[PDB]
Amino acid sequence: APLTYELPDETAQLKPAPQPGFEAAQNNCAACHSVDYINTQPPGKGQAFWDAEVQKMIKVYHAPVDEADAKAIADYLAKTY
């Protein structure tokens, strides 16, 4: 038989917020990687940092995220993290 490796269950979750970008982030930002990537970034970095993170996912890594969702997500992130 081949050898195999068992990963523990994934539990990383985004911080809830009333901004619509919370749900957009839940629906768009966990497809390629766990959301701990977001949870562990430096805190209170502000709008320009999160705008750049979101744009990099879309332009560099080809995250299929439309313009309205991209703004909602960046805005949610800059306000919440």
Add this chain to the structure above:
Amino acid sequence: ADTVTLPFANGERPLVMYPGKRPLIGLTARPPQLETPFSVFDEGLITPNDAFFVRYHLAGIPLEIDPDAFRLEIKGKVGTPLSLSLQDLKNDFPASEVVAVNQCSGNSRGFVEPRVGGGQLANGAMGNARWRGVPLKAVLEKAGVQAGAKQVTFGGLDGPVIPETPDFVKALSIDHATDGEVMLAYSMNGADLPWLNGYPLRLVVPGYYGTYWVKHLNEITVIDKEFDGFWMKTAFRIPDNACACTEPGKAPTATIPINRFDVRSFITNVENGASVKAGEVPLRGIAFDGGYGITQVSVSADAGKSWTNATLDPGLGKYSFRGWKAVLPLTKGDHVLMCRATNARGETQPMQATWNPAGYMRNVVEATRVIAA
């Protein structure tokens, strides 16, 4: 359940248990990225397999491998393409061994000021191990490298979740790849590679940052041009100057691929606020560089006003951690301890931390406040 807090902002992390590993600092789950608790580095010069840090870029890591079916393909500008089994590598080629530090490009990123995006690591994305395998030189010689070859590319079993995301593929110069020290490692600390450390085979690139050390390595291509894959052309770039640094908040004007380690050192037996007994205080730690040899480790107990020469432990090889010990008289009260290493070509550590946009290559003189009583 268990958590720790790293000594920078937003430092909380789960302690997580993976098969074949002790509890480690969980950075990301998909793909797994695991940092080693700093305390491990005081446990001995060789980092145990069950403690060794883990870093991956892409979620599609292999989770089932048949070692009998595994083949390393050698192709491109070679006279004879090769398809090598693990049994072939072990039987048909002489084995080499090297004790070598693997360290992530962004080890210590969490300490960079101002903070930058990326993997928010403390100092635990490094480890030292005794690697055994086949020098890449021997495999390339068997294939027969053609005149005009310029680079060699390296790819593994992992892949992107979404095929448009760039595949993880790295490149070395041909003269580097054939130097005899670059190794196709099938063994780590006398055992088969732990899964997350690249079972069943990985590239080991002594004295170079870990990004080159391609895990689950199955495809080697000799090329007659410079490789312009994303993870060479765009990722892992450093400022093209002596300090590999820019003014905080400024982009470099020109970059080159990250390459050799700079000189680092740590005191391993004390941490911030540790209590020591006033008098002769024993200190110990490690130091390493890109393979030139640690010439000296100086130690201070007055925030760098004055320095005492540490005694270097017997070495395990130029690419290994080098242990050191010093005994310092500490008067009662607070003391800021520092260690600073220099290597055989004059490279050393800066007293003041520098900066670059990616937060690569940190090597500032480490300070540790202790209380003598």
